[PDB]
Amino acid sequence: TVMVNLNIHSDYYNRSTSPWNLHRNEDPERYPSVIWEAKCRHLGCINADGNVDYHMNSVPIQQEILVLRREPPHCPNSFRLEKILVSVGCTCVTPIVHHV
Amino acid sequence: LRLLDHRALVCSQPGLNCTVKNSTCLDDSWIHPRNLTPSSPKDLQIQLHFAHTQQGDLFPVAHIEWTLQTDASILYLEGAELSVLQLNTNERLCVRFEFLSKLRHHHRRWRFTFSHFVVDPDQEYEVTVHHLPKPIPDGDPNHQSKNFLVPDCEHARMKVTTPCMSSGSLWDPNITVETLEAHQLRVSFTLWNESTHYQILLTSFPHMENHSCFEHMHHIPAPRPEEFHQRSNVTLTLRNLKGCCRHQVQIQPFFSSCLNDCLRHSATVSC
Amino acid sequence: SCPPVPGGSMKLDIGIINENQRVSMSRNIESRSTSPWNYTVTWDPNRYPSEVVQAQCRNLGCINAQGKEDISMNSVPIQQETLVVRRKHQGCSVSFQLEKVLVTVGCTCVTPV
Ligand SMILES: *[C@@H]1O[C@H](CO[C@@H]2O[C@H](CO)[C@H](O)[C@H](O)[C@H]2O)[C@@H](O[C@@H]2O[C@H](CO)[C@@H](O)[C@H](O)[C@H]2NC(C)=O)[C@H](O)[C@H]1NC(C)=O
Ligand SMILES: *[C@@H]1O[C@H](CO)[C@@H](O)[C@H](O)[C@H]1NC(C)=O
Fold first, then answer.
1. Which of A21, A59, B82, C74 is most buried, judged by most C-beta within 10 A?
2. What is the CATH number of the domain that holds C24?
């Protein structure tokens, strides 16, 4: 256990070829309390016209992050460090197609 | 980036009383620095292996090898933390080795191996061997790291691995596009043993123009465990156009293992 | 139960429970994306994690279907602000702080404004 000083030192989801929707991951004990977990809008990517190009895949970017949970759950400044998986955004890739 | 067996993992070597298991990649030696730190690992080397579980599944495992240096810092060696870092996701996994019996000779050089970290096909990892105690603030490195790269399911001994197979590495749709009379197309293909949907993707072209005269897409819903490995056929009405004959049929699976990013399979029919 | 909470600070037990044990096979797509990117390993010996992987957009624009760059589309970095622990020294004395580190997790392709 470590004593730490209290002072903890854009619109791409709509704009992107592979767009996403943010989901409310709310937690009253955890800090950050609310984390926005981005989930892909389509299976494919949005083409030059504004329709879905199914010859393309929209996959999400995922990350491990450090959050702090109140430990014990009630106490004021006593926290225990937590590691979690977060879907951050979606990118658009080219799918691996095998020919005959 | 999962450990293999929560078995009684052993690092116990002749002349070395050793024990291993789980660690947060934050050591007491980082929070509380000890004055006399031991020297860095010599000749670290990660190499790809495979593992067989009691259940009969085959898995890619990162095979961590290292040794120690001749110098007198040996007596002050208390253990070793082994990190594996998934570059794409920053997903860390650590195991510390607790040396109960302190090493004091160098008559025989000590060689070390860990081969329980399971690694996923087509990936990149920074595998570090941190000697413990960790060096004092503004101390010299004392660890070693090596970039380890796992191959894709095209790799020979990879496509017979459980993670590969589960993402349909050994699947063959034997896809066949037989032309029907009333300007139609029957599309025949074999199915995989997963209750996931698929998508047939038709792109008809003229005889050499490489731009779609007709593009169609069709959804084949999740098969029941009965329909597993049994060949399916879907009849689609083509665009009744002259020149628009050279077809391209692309079957896309949606296996849990990949979700969308799965291997697609292409068929190309002439005139 | 509650520990004796000292003033102007926090108690930070470091026993990090990974409540997110994935079980969703990820891959090396950095090379395949329309907005491709490279990864760089960052080592700060006085931080936790000591190793942080930052991503860097390969180009100003997005790569098309033929394999060449398209400038009418822009390659943007997508960032995730995370926490790190910072060890500091005055001498023999060691202090601990929490820092917010903005990490570039990869690149997406966006239509301009
Ligand atoms: C981003 O990466 C460029 C290409 O190299 C990558 O290397 C990776 C190695 O793990 C992997 O193979 C990946 O697929 C590759 O794309 C670098 O570009 C290279 O720069 C050299 C000079 O510095 C040139 O000699 C090379 O020809 C050039 N490669 C190409 C494809 O032209 C970039 O330097 C690098 N940039 C950043 C910001 O990290
Ligand atoms: C799917 O079939 C392959 C080959 O027969 C096998 O390796 C795999 O375990 C099967 N899985 C199920 C659930 O039937």
1. B82
2. 2.10.90.10
Chain pair A-B, CB pairs under 8 angstroms: 50
Determined by which method?
A: X-ray
Domains assigned to chain B: 1-166 (2.60.40.2160), 167-271 (2.60.40.2150)
Domain A10-100: give its CATH code: 2.10.90.10
Structural domains of chain C, count: 1
Of the candidates B106, B127, B109, B132, the one whose C-alpha atom is nearest the C-alpha of residue B117 is: B127
Q: Domain limits at C73?
A: 1-113
The resolution, in Å, is: 3.3
Q: Give the C-alpha separation, B259 to B255, whole Å.
A: 5
- The two beta strands, A57-70 and A30-31, are antiparallel
Give CA B254 to chain center in angstroms. 18
Which among B24, B257, B259 has CB closest to C14?
A: B24
Q: Which of A45, A66, A79 lies nearest to residue C11, judging by beta carbons? A: A79
CB burial of residue B181 (10 Å; 0-12, 13-18, 19+): exposed
Looking up tokens 């599309």, which residue turns up?
B187
Question: Residues 34..93 of A with a Cβ closer than 8 Å to B: which?
Answer: 43, 54-55, 57-59, 62-64, 81, 85, 93
**Cβ of B233 less than 6 Å from ligand 2:** no
Cβ contact B120–C14 (<8 Å): no
